[PDB]
Design a protein around this ligand. Structure first.
Ligand SMILES: Cc1cc2nc3c(=O)[nH]c(=O)nc-3n(C[C@H](O)[C@H](O)[C@H](O)COP(=O)(O)O)c2cc1C
Ligand SMILES: Cc1cc2nc3c(=O)[nH]c(=O)nc-3n(C[C@H](O)[C@H](O)[C@H](O)COP(=O)(O)O)c2cc1C
Ligand SMILES: [Cl-]
Ligand SMILES: [Cl-]
Lengths: 163, 164
């Protein structure tokens, strides 16, 4: 069920460092991303997929800071989402949902990262200074269990026929 | 395998079967998917205003139409209005929209994300504070027209490995 996939997908903050992601799994994740809807079908994104062992280490280190994202250096894959000139931001959320749901459907863990050293990750991967790097999605096999979800109550987030 | 088949079958449906209602249990599964979306800091900066009343749906759908776009919205029996509840909020709302439309497709329902609409009229019809930003209406209902193949950029334009 789709709902079981939604429930099992979580932010994994620990990865098996020595354990590679298979090329066919990653390709299906990026296909899900590419096939995302977008306003005007503008598809205003580029996914820079870091799979090189040494590069991924460096990208994951540049995602860490201020006590956050220490686990990022352990994920063997980092999908960097660059805005390709409002709706772009909505569109990139769409694509992130498709990446992380696809990762979970493939037995892989993921974590969307909005906090990182944008400058350094852009230098490491040759992204122009003038392009906005918006998210890094870490991908790898998880080592910790499924935590229980915390969400706001229905009444705070959902009303019928009425604000 | 299955997930990718779902991603390919989900599409923007631009015609609805006007007399066929959406089962409440299907709607509830879609809203559960939306609620369970991830968000930066788990802030969940959204409220879903779910229009199921036949007359109100008609009016919200009509207020989505203009410049010859979105004329089919008035035929959708359900409208999920996504209101921002204080960057990340916009990314978060796109996450939630993906969850809603994938969930709709998994239930055998059609959907269309609408970013263009008469925001003031829809707010006035539904009670949404003037000062709160209504960002999307997702129309939900049973489709009339068939599945199309996707038009997307080539892999090479949107995907590069290890370097931009
Ligand atoms: C943020 C957003 C806003 C959209 N607004 C509209 C709209 O107002 N009217 C419309 O007909 N389609 C709307 N679309 C649908 C897009 O045209 C559609 O997703 C895109 O063409 C890709 O086609 P597909 O959804 O059928 O794969 C919107 C999509 C997104 C993501
Ligand atoms: C836009 C965005 C950015 C995120 N940034 C981070 C981040 O930098 N570090 C982190 O540990 N989690 C990050 N997360 C994950 C959220 O904390 C997480 O999705 C939320 O707490 C709900 O938990 P769940 O994803 O396990 O269901 C981010 C999520 C989103 C949507
Ligand atoms: Cl559009
Ligand atoms: Cl967070």
């Amino acid at each position: 069920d789709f709902l079981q996939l939604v429930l099992s997908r979580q932010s994994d903050r620990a990865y098996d460092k020595g354990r590679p992601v298979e090329a066919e799994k990653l390709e299906r994740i990026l296909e899900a991303a590419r096939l995302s809807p977008s306003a005007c079908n503008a598809q205003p994104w580029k996914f820079v997929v870091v799979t090189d062992h040494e590069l991924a280490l460096k990208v994951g280190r540049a995602a860490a800071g201020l006590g956050m994202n220490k686990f990022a250096k352990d994920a063997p894959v980092h999908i960097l989402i660059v805005e390709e000139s409002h709706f772009p931001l909505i569109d990139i959320g769409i694509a992130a949902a498709h990446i992380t749901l696809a990762a979970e459907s493939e037995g892989l863990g993921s974590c969307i990262l909005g906090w990182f050293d944008e400058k350094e990750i852009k230098q490491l991967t040759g992204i122009p200074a003038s392009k906005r790097l918006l998210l890094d999605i870490a991908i790898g096999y998880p080592v910790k269990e499924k935590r229980k979800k915390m969400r706001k109550t229905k009444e705070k987030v959902i009303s019928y026929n009425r604000y």
